[PDB]
């Protein structure tokens, strides 16, 4: 054949840290369907927001938004525990159906995105050109996000352990841990991966007593 219908850009969802995770790769023939299981980013989350994106960039916001919805009613549980199956299905007419279902609760939400949504031909060519030009920078951004996500988790976990240690944590340890948590929070806002990893290490270095 000399012609066929494709979806012209990758389609996916935003995941923790503001990155795009692809469910359907650019130029996949339609119709097509793909699912992937995700979990929650922080402890006790009862909802997830599904931000549907079209594009090739690793920073979620650099891609085009197709729509968003929340899936609510997840039982609050440790981060990583819920299993939220997200399915993208593009039919032969280009209509994209996205669903998210929490396996434990059975709660499901979905949206239908019309085939005319998303970027036009000129914008599609520009997205592909910009993504190619920024390939290395986007990889470095994904590394930075992986590290911030680890840092953000350590910040929550440590606060949780401080709050659970009560008066069993000596006071001097508490003061050092608090000032380390501040320094880690500050680094997390920056774009320097090594700085975040260093403030993770400095926090670990004052948390030994807390680690019991």
């Amino acid at each position: 054949v000399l012609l066929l219908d494709v979806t012209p850009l990758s389609l996916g969802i935003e995941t923790m840290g503001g990155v795009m995770t692809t469910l359907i790769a650019k130029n996949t023939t339609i119709p097509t369907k793909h699912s992937q299981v995700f979990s929650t980013a922080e402890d006790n989350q009862s909802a997830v927001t599904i931000h549907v994106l079209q594009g090739e960039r690793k920073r979620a916001a650099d891609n085009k938004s197709l729509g968003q919805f929340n899936l609510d009613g997840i039982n609050p549980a440790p981060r990583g525990m819920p299993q939220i199956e997200v399915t993208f299905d593009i039919d032969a007419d280009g209509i994209l159906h996205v669903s998210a279902k929490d396996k434990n609760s059975g709660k499901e939400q979905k949206i239908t995105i019309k085939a005319s949504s998303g970027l036009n031909e000129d914008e599609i060519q520009k997205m592909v050109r910009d993504a190619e030009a920024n390939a290395e920078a986007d990889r470095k951004f994904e590394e930075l996000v992986q590290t911030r996500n680890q840092g953000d988790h350590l910040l929550h976990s440590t606060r949780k352990q401080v709050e659970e240690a009560g008066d069993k944590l000596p006071a001097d340890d508490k003061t050092a841990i608090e000032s380390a948590l501040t320094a880690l929070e500050t680094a997390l806002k920056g774009e320097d991966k090594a700085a975040i990893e260093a403030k993770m290490q400095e926090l670990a270095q004052v948390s030994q007593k807390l680690m019991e």
Partner: peptide
């Protein structure tokens, strides 16, 4: 590990 979602 699965990838994570905020919300």
């Amino acid at each position: 590990n699965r990838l994570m979602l905020t919300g």
